Amino acid sequence: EEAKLTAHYSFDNNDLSDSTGNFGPGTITGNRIDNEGGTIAYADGKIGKAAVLNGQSGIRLPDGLVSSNQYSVSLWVKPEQLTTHTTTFFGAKDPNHWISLVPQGWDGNTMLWSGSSPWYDGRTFWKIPTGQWTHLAFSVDNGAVKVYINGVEKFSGTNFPDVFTGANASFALGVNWWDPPFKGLIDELRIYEGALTPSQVTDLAQ
């Protein structure tokens, strides 16, 4: 049972639209998820045109993008800088119940982070470079969670929080409620219902 695709934010057309047509387009935020006045440029990315994030800007995605107990997220990033706790994909029912794919987390490594009630540490023990393209993916199947870097599985575990089942949660690229906005390039955002097979993974990564 391969994971089913639901959303593809590719930026290929120099806009924040979902190419599958399922979801409304993304918005532009200021330096947090809940504010406005940012900027988004478009530069050559991993596939076609990628989104540029200047370190004070983000993208609001539509509420309820993920709303199940079985889901996955894939994307490419090219960091111009790294800042601790700063999100890529995020992630939140409210400020106390959130998920976050973090390039440099509290242990200084890439991690899938959830908090704060409770706290989940999805530690990869792997560190991301600036000025290079890294592929990141992760799947959630009823508490069963796995994290992939460049196609390589680095974290697995269980008892992941069901943050999204029953909630109209806020989703964003590059910003949250507390930390520096991501700076650099984000490309090819894809959302899935169901947990990506290893095969789909290695495909997406290469």
Ligand X SMILES: OC[C@@H]1O[C@@H](OC[C@@H]2O[C@@H](OC[C@@H]3O[C@@H](O)[C@H](O)[C@H]3O)[C@H](O)[C@H]2O)[C@H](O)[C@H]1O
Instruction: By CB under 6 A, name the binding residues for ligand X.
Output: 85, 106, 115-116, 119, 121, 178-179
- Figure out which of the listed residues 35, 47, 143, 198 binds Ca ion, where binding follows CB under 5 A: 47
Q: Pick the piece of the chain touching Ca ion (CB under 5 A) from 80-88, 148-156, 168-176, 183-191.
A: 183-191
Shortest Å distance, C-beta 106 to ligand X = 4
**E strands in 47-182:** 49-54, 58-61, 70-79, 89-94, 97-102, 111-116, 120-123, 134-141, 144-149, 152-157, 170-173
And the tokens for 18?
């979902």
Q: Applying CB under 5 A, does 12 fall inside the site for Ca ion?
A: yes
- Figure out which of the listed residues 187, 189, 190, 191 binds Ca ion, where binding follows CB under 5 A: 187
Side chain identity at residue 188, one-letter code: E
Nearer to ligand X, 155 or 192 (CB): 155
Quote the radius of gyration of the chain (alpha carbons, Å): 15
Q: Applying CB under 5 A, does 15 fall inside the site for Ca ion?
A: no
187 annotated ligand-binding residue: yes
Q: In this structure, is the dihedral angle defined by the CA atoms of residues 2, 141, 148 and 186, taken in order, positive or negative?
A: positive
Binding site for Ca ion (CB under 5 A): 10-12, 45, 47-48, 187
